Design a protein around this nucleic acid. Structure first.
Ligand SMILES: [Mg+2]
Ligand SMILES: [Mg+2]
Length: 132
RNA sequence: UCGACA
DNA sequence: ATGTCG
């Protein structure tokens, strides 16, 4: 019951909080469709969030109706709420990731999308295809 | 007091 | 170890 005609997204980090990146892959072929340059400090959930929103923008710009898979219950709820409820301290260190988070929320609040955001079922299907 | 997703 | 929600 994997919807193979989909985009899969994931975060990778070194530390948490720590250096965060993310990418999106074609679920069928594994081809890397986008990959964000590493952000010096962020959280896992911030990156999972940014990855979904990036995915929405990617698909919207390309007139694609493909769903997005994420394994993150947290990020899926933050996107649905249009609100990233991160605990990470907002200070000079974390300014870049908070800026990105702010700009993602703002995109969600200025655009429509129909993309279904689906939970990847890691316990049945193994690791999401975007995994680092 | 946990249970779960990362 | 930490970041998050139910
Ligand atoms: Mg993940
Ligand atoms: Mg993962």
């Amino acid at each position: 019951e994997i919807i193979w005609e989909s985009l899969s997204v994931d975060v990778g980090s070194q530390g948490n909080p720590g250096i965060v990146e993310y990418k999106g892959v074609d679920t069928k072929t594994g081809e890397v469709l986008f990959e964000r340059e590493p952000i010096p400090i962020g959280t896992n959930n911030m990156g999972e969030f940014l990855a979904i929103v990036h995915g929405l923008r990617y698909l919207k710009e390309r007139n694609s109706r493909k769903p997005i898979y994420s394994n993150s219950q947290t990020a899926i709820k933050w996107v649905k709420d249009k609100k990233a409820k991160s605990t990470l301290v907002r200070n000079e260190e974390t300014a870049l990731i908070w800026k990105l988070v702010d700009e993602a929320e703002e995109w969600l609040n200025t655009h429509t999308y129909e993309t279904p955001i689906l939970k990847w079922q890691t316990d049945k299907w193994g690791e999401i295809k975007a995994d680092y």
